[PDB]
Amino acid sequence: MEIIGGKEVSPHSRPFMASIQYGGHHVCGGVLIDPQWVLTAAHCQYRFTKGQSPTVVLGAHSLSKNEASKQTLEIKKFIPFSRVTSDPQSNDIMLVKLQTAAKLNKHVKMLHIRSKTSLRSGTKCKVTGWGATDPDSLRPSDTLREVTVTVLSRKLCNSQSYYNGDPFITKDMVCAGDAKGQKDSCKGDAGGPLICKGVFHAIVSGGHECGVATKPGIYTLLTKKYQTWIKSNLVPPHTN
């Protein structure tokens, strides 16, 4: 009856997944949405380093083991929703610009951004990424896993019982967790996607404690606000 957690997915069943890495170490999730662009949380950009070669890993299942599918590209420029510095609070959404477009095979595909589709609370969604299962684990998950979640209601998520206004869940964010209203995925899950009913809806917002009742996960919703932003960077490109 009790006991419940995530499960490791079928190797390379999420061809769009990407690992953001500093010095070869995974720090966040991301979603390839165009040959030379990754979408991830902005929290995921370590600012206290001019070094630590930032790299993106695609077509991977195991963060450790070698793989005929893996592709390591280099970040050309981080495009965060904030300008230079600004307020490193809300708007936890970022665009990673790669040095070269990535080879597209069956283990490495793109995921499309949501459009007209909306997201009602109560929906069963799935989070994908490399987040550890031990609240104390100092290392992320080796294999790529997946957890099921339920979109909580803002009214209930903004209650005194939950975040109670701090952070306040605006119209662009969304909550999700188990019946205990808590977050499953732990270390290294930030940046991953929130796919519901087969539609890429949001981005896992980083910087939140895992395993605490009434403290669900926050997600950045791909609202018109960010579609616009996305479209401008990716369109127009640099062809001409």
Curated annotation (Swiss-Prot):
Annotated active site: H43 (charge relay system), D92 (charge relay system), A190 (charge relay system)
GO BP annotations, alphabetical order: granzyme-mediated programmed cell death signaling pathway; protein maturation; proteolysis
Propeptide, residue positions: 1-2
EC identifiers of the protein: 3.4.21.-
GO cellular component: extracellular space
Family: Belongs to the peptidase S1 family. Granzyme subfamily.
The protein's name in its UniProt record: Granzyme K
Taxonomic placement: Eukaryota, Metazoa, Chordata, Craniata, Vertebrata
Gene name tied to this protein: GZMK
